[PDB]
Amino acid sequence: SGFRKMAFPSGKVEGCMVQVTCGTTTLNGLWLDDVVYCPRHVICTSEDMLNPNYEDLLIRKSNHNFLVQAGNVQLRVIGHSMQNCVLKLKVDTANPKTPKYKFVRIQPGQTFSVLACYNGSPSGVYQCAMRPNFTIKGSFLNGSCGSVGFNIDYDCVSFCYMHHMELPTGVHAGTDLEGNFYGPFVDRQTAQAAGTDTTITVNVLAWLYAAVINGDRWFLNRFTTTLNDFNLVAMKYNYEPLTQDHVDILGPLSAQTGIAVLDMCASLKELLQNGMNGRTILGSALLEDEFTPFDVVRQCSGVT
Amino acid sequence: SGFRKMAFPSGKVEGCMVQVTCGTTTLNGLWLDDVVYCPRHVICTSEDMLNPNYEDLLIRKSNHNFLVQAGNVQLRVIGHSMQNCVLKLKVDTANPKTPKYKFVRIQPGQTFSVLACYNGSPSGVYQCAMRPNFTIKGSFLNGSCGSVGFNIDYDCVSFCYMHHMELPTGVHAGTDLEGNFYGPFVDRQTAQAAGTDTTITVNVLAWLYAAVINGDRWFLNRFTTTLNDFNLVAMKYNYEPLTQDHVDILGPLSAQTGIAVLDMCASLKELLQNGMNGRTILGSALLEDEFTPFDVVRQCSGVT
Ligand SMILES: O=C(Cc1cccnc1)Nc1cccc(O[C@H]2CC(=O)N2)c1
Ligand SMILES: O=C(Cc1cccnc1)Nc1cccc(O[C@H]2CC(=O)N2)c1
Fold first, then answer.
1. How far is CA A184 from the centre of its chain?
2. How many other CB atoms are found less than 10 A from the CB of residue B43?
3. Which structural domain, as residue segments, surrounds residue A59?
4. Domain of B30: which CATH number?
């Protein structure tokens, strides 16, 4: 027993982290096969970031202007191209450490691990969720651009995020591995603001199931509700509307615990309306929304 | 910016994880050089655990009775010995993936990463602290015994914990890599209880410094206090007494922020006496004690 914000083992991803330097700028790159993926703002100077024309800026860049280093060895860049907001640097050596990988665009609500990196070197790993407003609440400093978000299935790494920027509000914006930003964010140093951050209801429910499994049963009440009535209370508290798909995904958790999804919803409705009264759930004084129903089953069943 | 419970990259430790089977029992082992370290309760049956005589039980065990598997390859055990509560299985092949390592016994209050494992395979990584009562609040299921706690410095892994058991209260007990339990715990299926779990004051202070660095400044007040007055309030709330050593270790955080340690103590005294009033600090509705002052500087400076 015990419930922690667990991240996937990062070894398969550490093997891919490289340092990419363009002029004065150094950031991280992802080396899979003979391609190094990195944010395209590596070709920018601090003046360029205000209003950059990336096609024009890339025209003044040649293969030799991009310095790629993997540990202490320099990789020869034989080609370069721009795919949306990522640069793909073709290198002459394929990464011998390349794991089985997929490039995937995750949905908001879904979770993933981040391997924060500086100068192509990993500093730490933590679990994140793609917020409904398409930002992530990460831990990133200047120099962490190019750090990737990933999931692991058996031996296959699904890369879903590449860090590009921080908004003045302290939240982080980034792209999938095809260079497409999650949300309305543009890789320009212009005032951008994240919209309303809503709470991932299905994840809070999954974590309530995880608390019941672990012994925290105080919040369980003698009540039930309907999907429409629960959603009236979810609306007021900026919670994502619960759908029958969500109820379905909670099915294995509901089946294991023996608590109906709508019963857990009534318990959640009371937690929203009445607060926690100074008590805690899984050592947390607030309702946690960064565990998907898949994360809960995986952690409560030891899926390696 | 952003502050997360970050764990060290686990790649160097994944390379050491092996599966150790003795009779019907399977658990994890740590393969460093030609030695595999694992909990000695691997030689026990469910009946033996009630009151085991490990010397007598080991006398009926031979080199061939311990099955060690690293991935899909069986390792030949050429020697076996008991060091306190760990078995050291000498194998004929040295681990080619052995990183630079030290075996260290950490103090309560200190933090470390755990690579939870099942059948010699890593399932996830998370950050932990050694509680003042010598237990850890981990996430472990049956089959995770042998999972290790570690820290990383540059390229050197300092192994500090090996998971052995779970107490009926849901907390976890284990040993250093010399087989010595942290705390009064014995590897026997007998009713054991953890003592009072106090709050690591210096870590809560370090995390208040991390909140100030990150923009959360609401809790800052126009007051100060003395070490003895603060400790009167720490005592009432089961907080560890603050010493001049703690004030010293907080020195670089105090120097960076410009807030005196005793000033932060007055802010903490008010948080203890008045609560958080529904507000949050670093997205947490309670006072976090699992970040050391070293963890704070490392995360707020990008130490790879
Ligand atoms: O933020 C970083 C580096 C960094 C520092 C700290 C943490 N993570 C990333 N770069 C950057 C890149 C592209 C646009 C950009 O403009 C900002 C203004 C806005 O809203 N977005 C900034
Ligand atoms: O707990 C486990 C396996 C396990 C299961 C879930 C999570 N982590 C570990 N084994 C074990 C080993 C040695 C003594 C022992 O007795 C318990 C009674 C007590 O207080 N300690 C139990």
1. 16
2. 22
3. 15-99
4. 2.40.10.10
Q: Where are the alpha helices (DSSP H) in A94-163?
A: none
Check if the beta carbon of residue B49 is closer than 8 Å to that of residue B42. Answer: no
End-of-domain residue from the set A74, A99, A124: A99
Rounded to the nearest angstrom, the minimum Cα separation between A199 and chain B is 13
Report resolution (Å) to 1 decimal. Answer: 2.2
Residues 6+ apart with CB under 8 A from A153: none
* Residue B266 shares a structural domain with residue B153: no
How many CB atoms neighbour CB A59 within 10 A? Answer: 9
For A213, name the nearest residue in chain B, comparing CA atoms only: B170
Counting atoms of ligand 2 from 1, which one is nearest the CA of B193? 20
* CATH for A233: 1.10.1840.10
* Cβ A27 under 6 angstroms from ligand 1: no
Strand, coil or helix: A12:
helix
Q: Which atom of ligand 1 is nearest to the CA of A166?
A: 1
